[PDB]
């Protein structure tokens, strides 16, 4: 049996970037044909690993992460990047080895009236670490102390993406899949 990539990329529902979800893909040999030549993907960059050679790999231990972001935020799904997405929602290690995939989902994730189901975090004390995930929704104060609304200087940290079918491509929704490759040599004990 081959690795079930279709259930990741072709899944019906995708999550908000702040609540990005991770699928382990192992105990399978991967047929990368479906990603290599397609008309499906608008963005496809690989980092650290050879973009040409992924079908050669033989001992697969990959993690697939899924989320939705706005077109201009796809730039932030890269190593060493700054911004509200990279800092507070999904951070990629400098040493990243793996691939970053995204495709326009305007016709299925945006509406003329506006789809506000997708969310991102925009306030946080301190940047996420690589592959860290934060689904907390607690009130935020710019001085770090605890906080109870409706007190002054007390804010909620999540906000909606608003996806309309009339905006430019930079504001249209994009489904993203990040494939991370475990290190090839892991020491369990001495």
């Amino acid at each position, epitope marked *: 049996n081959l690795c079930p990539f279709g259930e990741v990329f072709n899944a019906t529902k995708f999550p908000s970037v702040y609540a990005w979800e991770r699928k382990k893909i192992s105990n399978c040999v991967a047929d990368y044909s479906v990603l*290599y*030549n397609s*008309t499906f993907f*608008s*963005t496809f*960059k*690989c980092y650290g690993v050879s*973009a040409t050679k992924l079908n050669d790999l033989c001992f697969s231990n990959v993690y697939a992460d899924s989320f939705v972001v706005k077109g201009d935020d796809v*730039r932030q799904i890269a190593p060493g990047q700054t911004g509200v997405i990279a800092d507070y929602n999904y951070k990629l290690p400098d040493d990243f080895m793996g691939c970053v995939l995204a495709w326009n989902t305007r016709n299925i994730d945006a509406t003329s009236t506006g789809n506000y189901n997708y969310k991102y975090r925009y306030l946080r004390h301190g940047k996420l670490r690589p592959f860290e995930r934060d689904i907390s929704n607690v009130p935020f104060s710019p001085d770090g102390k605890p906080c109870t609304p409706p007190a002054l200087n007390c804010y909620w940290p999540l906000n909606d993406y608003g996806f309309y079918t009339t905006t430019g*491509i930079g504001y249209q929704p994009y489904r993203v899949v990040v494939l991370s490759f475990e290190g090839s040599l892991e020491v369990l004990f001495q």
Partner: nanobody, 125 residues
Framework: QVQLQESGGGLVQAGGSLRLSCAASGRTFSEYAMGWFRQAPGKEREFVATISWSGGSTYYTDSVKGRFTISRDNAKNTVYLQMNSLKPDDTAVYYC??????????????????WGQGTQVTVSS
């Protein structure tokens, strides 16, 4: 050192065809992705199509989906853009562009490191 040059543009009229070409130099052409961009007068430069180093995977902007065809010739060190059923909207200066290391495909102008000068394409009606 590493440069592109456009060719094959000109005057055509609505419903005709035009076959753009772009020759590259400076490194191995078969190791990088290429992409076509265009800029209507006044409006900002937008993306048209992109081809992988192998020619296997492609992607197009919607305004041309079904009409335009991107293909390459690694033996010939050049990538083309067949344009059918042109419409006055398609008037633009067409920029050839080459991607960087690790970029399989991209519709994003910031992911291409080298740009050609552009060839005029005018469709009139």
């Amino acid at each position: 050192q590493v440069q592109l040059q456009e060719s094959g543009g000109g005057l055509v009229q609505a419903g005709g065809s035009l076959r753009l070409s772009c020759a590259a130099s400076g490194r191995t052409f078969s190791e990088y992705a290429m992409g076509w961009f265009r800029q209507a007068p006044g409006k900002e430069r937008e993306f048209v199509a992109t081809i992988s180093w192998s020619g296997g995977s492609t992607y197009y902007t919607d305004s041309v989906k079904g009409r335009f065809t991107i293909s390459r010739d690694n033996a010939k060190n050049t990538v083309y853009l067949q344009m059918n059923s042109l419409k006055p909207d398609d008037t633009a200066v067409y920029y050839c562009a080459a991607a960087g290391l690790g970029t399989v495909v991209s519709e994003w102008d910031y992911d291409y490191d080298y740009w050609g000068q552009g060839t005029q394409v005018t469709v009139s009606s």
